[PDB]
Amino acid sequence: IVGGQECKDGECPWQALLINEENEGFCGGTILSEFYILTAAHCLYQAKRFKVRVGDRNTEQEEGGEAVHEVEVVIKHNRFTKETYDFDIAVLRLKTPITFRMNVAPACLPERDWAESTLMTQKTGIVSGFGRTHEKGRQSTRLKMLEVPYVDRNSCKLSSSFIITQNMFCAGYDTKQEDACQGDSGGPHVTRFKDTYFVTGIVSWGEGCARKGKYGIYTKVTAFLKWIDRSMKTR
């Protein structure tokens, strides 16, 4: 997360961090239920074996309120391709149930139509993670969040040096130095509605971090809703 504020106690409970055997946090994730985690598919390429962590806000000050979980099954989207970042989604079925407490709660899955009509038409959304603070910088030790305005789909395609598919959408700023960054991949993008947050996008990619004239590219969750349900039945 470049810019943005710090996730204050209880503000980003649906956050999840994928960690390698070296125990380093490399990607993000969203808590859907006690058994399922949502993430980017390209993230299942930045580590051999990895666990998923929840309830953490400071990767060094053992808040004692954290909890690590093992992955039983990784459900990667078949049509996912690295050469286009299309279908950049994935679902993780946990080995043990996540116990919900402070800083550990699930984000809501919205209805496909309502979402596109009332959620993505909202002025902004929230993206969060333990990713780099700057393009060249280092991974963050604290969990951050950033209000990123929804970007016009046309402005998006125009500013992009790559094909922005139907499975993606832009969010962020043209010039302001704020946007997700490395390590934030797979993390959550949520939209607020009457004090309830709904999942809307999976941190996918970008051309650099917070560069002038470039936006943040997220996976369009509403375009994979049904796929996600199917996965909740492990398929």
Added chain:
Amino acid sequence: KLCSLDNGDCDQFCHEEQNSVVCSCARGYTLADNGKACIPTGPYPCGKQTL
């Protein structure tokens, strides 16, 4: 009808059933009696900051 008015005055999901509006809630909520509001069923409902 008119879920485009003010979300139909629903707390969450809004659907227009030909005539009027039909509100619904995410998994883990139950529609209030006014057929609009959503109420949690457990202590950690999806979408709520835990404070």
